[PDB]
Amino acid sequence: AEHVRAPSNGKIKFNEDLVHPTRTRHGHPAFLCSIDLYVTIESEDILHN
Amino acid sequence: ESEEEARRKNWVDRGWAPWEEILSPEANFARKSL
Amino acid sequence: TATSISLGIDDLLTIPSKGWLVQDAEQQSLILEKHHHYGNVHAVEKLRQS
């Protein structure tokens, strides 16, 4: 019930082997996580974790 | 009614035919996924 | 009495980011409507997203 939003503008980098494929309740393609993950957004000024 | 019988009635009477459906990359996902 | 608080039309401020947020939500909603039509999403799903 909480939505992680984006800290800043930029490219999102993560490894896709760890996550597993799914279809959401609203019909969209998505990935499901059952292990902890670190996602980074590469804004030109800084990296957000 | 057994399905076999019903499949007959639909062909002889109501016109059923399993025609082909050409679908988009997205619709195929929909049919298989759900 | 001395400070005298009052309320005016331009004192009802709105958050700076509202336009961007409403505009984006509206885009998502249009795209989902084209897709219900084309067969890629079902009805219970359209209702829920909205």
From Swiss-Prot, chain C:
Disulfide bonds: none annotated. It is found in: Plastid, Chloroplast. DNA-dependent RNA polymerase catalyzes the transcription of DNA into RNA using the four ribonucleoside triphosphates as substrates. In plastids the minimal PEP RNA polymerase catalytic core is composed of four subunits: alpha, beta, beta', and beta''. When a (nuclear-encoded) sigma factor is associated with the core the holoenzyme is formed, which can initiate transcription. Belongs to the RNA polymerase beta' chain family. RpoC2 subfamily. This is DNA-directed RNA polymerase subunit beta''. It comes from Nicotiana tabacum. The chain holds residues 55 to 104 of 1392 of the full protein.
